[PDB]
UniProtKB/Swiss-Prot annotation:
This is DNA polymerase I. Coiled coil: none annotated. One of its GO terms (biological process) is double-strand break repair. It comes from Escherichia coli (strain K12). Belongs to the DNA polymerase type-A family.
Length: 601
């Protein structure tokens, strides 16, 4: 148990100063902030904790205000004394999710520098799939130590306390332990992170430098117009009512729009093969087949999609506007995906329909402030260009080299016809093949996406490998080393460990073999995107132009640029993204602008 004897609670300047002096001569020190909220932009600093050595840590309360709380160094005095150390790039800090901390300090005009180690990221790079990368999971895995939980000091449910209401010493136990455990975790993981120059490279030049740029992107937020969203909601209520009527009218009586309950009894009872359509889904969608002739499945389909969209973005988004900035602040997660791509929540920007009109209207609500424009910079099929390189295929490499549509180029070879004559159906077939290879899909899988018979799909795949031999050789070689070493790598050294690579279980080893082929391309795209963000952010920080990087979704970076600077800025973003990342993969950045994200997109 952690008691009040473990860590000191600093309540006077003289003592704070004695610690600042020791901190100033330490090789590295753990740092942590405690606040009255999870919302970064509006949270208030309540206290700070440091750890100079395992077992030697302190908690400095500055804003606890429960009834009769003892005197504390003021938030302002503590920060002016701590500011020099915190802003000194030479004073190296360790922490668990330093992104949060860097931002809190920014609420006071302090730029945390020396952001050298983040134990969450050390863990993530050591093995992204070892398990959760939060401090409590980490402490238990590497230290066989269970940490004091927030719920243990604050309580649960609606009556949970906010940090400023917790007694000084209890808050101390929690806060000082964080700092202490964090430093211990670093001492155990940092040495390990050196057994290999690949992960070390990614951790050092990709992951750590990205910490402060994500903080800045998140705190910038994005301007969302709530009127547009509201009218879209009202219209969707009318449209959903209308569709409900159109459905009742196509059949007879009233009924819910749920399959395997009300639909199979109507749809199949009036002709159609018995199997219902599961919302599995993108592999055999019963309702959409019928759609080509049967009108009911069509309106039920278009109904559900609209209902999901309304409650997920039309009704939720306006509620996400922060009263303090008047903008929305999405959460980017840097240590969650297995391949290294950034994920996103509240809102999850990647789930906004891309090829659909309603998705387009959602994006029309992401607007640029007065005298500014939204700019979208996209890496054209970066994953496919990465495959051309990894397969050393002169065919693909040349297609990209001369600017041809790889899907039409691919079709012209697989079907053997001039590029000008390739039809829309042939382009659609080549495209399914191409993107199917990335996700390592089976000839049968391809068939299920192309709506053609088995072995006909096999026919297309054999023709492809004959024309593009380098891709089969890459695929075989990759599944090989995957079994030889138990993991695959990205161009920068990032690793995805594949434990079921020999699973014996068919399905699991199947998944592990698809992952083997895929991860290197997706992880590499991820690494390129992060390097571009770091690069563009560095220019932004150095030159201070009239632009803000507000979003990162899929393979695009979105900015707010002053209307009178768009041309020079576009030239610059463009050169940085395709000339300041990797010079080996043939990259192309499509830059576009408009009044909203939909127009620039
Ligand atoms: Zn904490």
């Amino acid at each position: 148990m952690i008691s009040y004897d473990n860590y000191v609670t600093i309540l006077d300047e003289e003592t704070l100063k004695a610690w600042i002096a020791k901190l100033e001569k330490a090789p590295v020190f753990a740092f942590d902030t405690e606040t009255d909220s999870l919302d970064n932009i509006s949270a208030n600093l309540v206290g700070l904790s440091f750890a100079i050595e395992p077992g030697v840590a302190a908690y400095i309360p500055v804003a606890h205000d429960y009834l009769d709380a003892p005197d504390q160094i003021s938030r302002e005095r503590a920060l002016e004394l701590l500011k020099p150390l915190l802003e000194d790039e030479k004073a190296l800090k360790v922490g668990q999710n330093l992104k949060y901390d860097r931002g809190i300090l920014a609420n006071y005009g302090i730029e945390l520098r020396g952001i050298a180690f983040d134990t969450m990221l050390e863990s993530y790079i050591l093995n992204s799939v070892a398990g959760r990368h939060d401090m409590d999971s980490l402490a238990e895995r590497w230290l066989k130590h269970k940490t004091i939980t927030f719920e243990e000091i604050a309580g649960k449910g609606k009556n949970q306390l906010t940090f400023n209401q917790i007694a000084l010493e209890e808050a101390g136990r929690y806060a000082a332990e964080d700092a202490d455990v964090t430093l211990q975790l670093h001492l155990k993981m940092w040495p390990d992170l050196q057994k290999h120059k690949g992960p070390l490279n990614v951790f050092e030049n990709i992951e750590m430098p990205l910490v402060p740029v994500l903080s800045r992107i998140e705190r910038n937020g994005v301007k969302i117009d709530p009127k547009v969203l509201h009218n879209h909601s009202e219209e969707l209520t009318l449209r959903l009512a209308e569709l409900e009527k159109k459905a009742h009218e196509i059949a007879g009586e009233e009924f819910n729009l749920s399959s395997t309950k009300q639909l199979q009894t109507i749809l199949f009872e009036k002709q159609g093969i018995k199997p219902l359509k599961k919302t599995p889904s993108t592999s055999e969608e019963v309702l959409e087949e019928l759609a080509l002739d049967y009108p009911l499945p069509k309106v039920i389909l278009e109904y559900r999609g609209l209902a999901k969209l309304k409650s997920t973005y039309t009704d939720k988004l306006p509620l996400m506007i922060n009263p303090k900035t008047g903008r929305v602040h999405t959460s980017y997660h840097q240590a969650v995906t297995a391949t290294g791509r950034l994920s996103s929540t509240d809102p999850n920007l990647q789930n906004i329909p891309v090829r659909n009109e309603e998705g387009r209207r959602i994006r029309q609500a992401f607007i640029a402030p007065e005298d500014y424009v939204i700019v979208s910079a996209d890496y054209s099929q970066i994953e496919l260009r990465i495959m051309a390189h990894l397969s050393r295929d002169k065919g693909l490499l040349t297609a990209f080299a001369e600017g041809k549509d790889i899907h039409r180029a691919t079709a012209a070879e697989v079907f053997g016809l001039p590029l000008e004559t390739v039809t829309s159906e042939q382009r659609r077939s080549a495209k399914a093949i191409n993107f199917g290879l990335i996700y390592g899909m089976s000839a049968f899988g391809l068939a299920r996406q192309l709506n053609i018979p088995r072995k006909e799909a096999q026919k297309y795949m054999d023709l492809y490998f004959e024309r593009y031999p380098g891709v089969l050789e890459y695929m075989e070689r990759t599944r090989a080393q995957a079994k030889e070493q138990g993991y695959v790598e990205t161009l920068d050294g990032r690793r995805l460990y594949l434990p079921d690579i020999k699973s014996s279980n068919g399905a699991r080893r199947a998944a592990a073999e698809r992952a083997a082929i895929n991860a290197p391309m997706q992880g590499t795209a991820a690494d390129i995107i992060k390097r571009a963000m770091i690069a563009v952010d560095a220019w932004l920080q150095a030159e201070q132009p009239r632009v803000r990087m507000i979003m990162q979704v899929h393979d695009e970076l979105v900015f707010e640029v002053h209307k009178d600077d768009v041309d020079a800025v576009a030239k610059q973003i463009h050169q940085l993204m395709e000339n300041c990342t990797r010079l080996d993969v043939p990259l192309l950045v499509e830059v576009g602008s408009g009044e909203n994200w939909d127009q620039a997109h």
